[PDB]
């Protein structure tokens, strides 16, 4: 869907921004700093579900640019494992939210965050 | 969910970018330039459904900035009507996609586009 590589870069950066707001806005809830409303969190995690599937297709062939390391493309099966671990932890987070359990949510949120960081550390260029 | 107004600006700009890719990537299909696969379009319109609800909450109170006109806040019921017309045309687009009919899809796509432009012309700052 991208006319030039820069269009894929812009898309994935926007998707990751949006996805990252939906994740991070739950931090006060899982820390107990903000109240836990099970329906609110279930709806938010549904939005995060959708968003968390979107970035990866915008790292096609020859979309080098932005802060994406070239290793994303030359080590494709591996990058795919970092992405698939992350989305399987998103499935777990959905399960916790859908069930309405703050303990389970806390644990699942931590697992997702660890998977964000694992990919970050391997595949996002240094700042 | 925004620490500063600039965070709400960044969110809505990203949401609108992402939402706009999901809309515009269907243009070759509705023009007949690309093939029509009903299941592909149904899945894409589901993603657009989700995205099209996201920008508006990031125009809260005192999030002036970006290319948002101040009239968005001082004429709140009206802006809300531009937003609600747009999302009701997104409901129609979902219906067309879910039904699998290219004629209906074409018509519904045109209606959505007109609603994007109506809001653009009233509420996005001039370039
Ligand atoms: C788990 C919920 C997260 C969160 C919170 C973020 N990511 Fe990542 N990310 C990855 C790569 C390769 C990039 C660079 C993209 C590019 O510049 O081309 C990023 C970038 C980000 C950003 C910055 C976006 C921007 O506005 O420029 C942010 C806020 C962000 N990430 C947060 C790679 C990955 C992964 C590889 C499989 C995974 C998993 C994640 N990111 C997960 C998350
Ligand atoms: C219907 C599907 C669309 C499409 C394709 C776009 N919009 Fe809008 N838009 C609105 C406002 C106030 C802004 C400015 C936001 C800000 O800068 O603070 C925008 C901006 C955009 C962009 C640019 C995003 C960016 O990267 O900076 C794009 C690509 C875009 N729009 C496309 C307002 C509205 C509406 C008011 C109710 C509606 C409806 C739409 N936009 C609809 C669409």
Swiss-Prot record, chains A, B:
Pfam families: Cytochrom_C_2. PROSITE patterns: CYTCII (PS51009). GO terms for biological process: electron transport chain. Heme c binds at residues 12-13, 67, 116, 119-120. Keywords: Electron transport, Heme, Iron, Metal-binding, Periplasm, Pyrrolidone carboxylic acid, Transport. The modification Pyrrolidone carboxylic acid is found at residue 1. Binds 1 heme c group covalently per subunit. Homodimer. It comes from Alcaligenes xylosoxydans xylosoxydans (Achromobacter xylosoxidans). GO terms for molecular function: electron transfer activity; heme binding; iron ion binding. It comes from the Bacteria. This is Cytochrome c'. GO terms for cellular component: periplasmic space. It is found in: Periplasm. Cytochrome c' is the most widely occurring bacterial c-type cytochrome. Cytochromes c' are high-spin proteins and the heme has no sixth ligand. Their exact function is not known. The lineage of its organism: Bacteria, Pseudomonadati, Pseudomonadota, Betaproteobacteria, Burkholderiales.
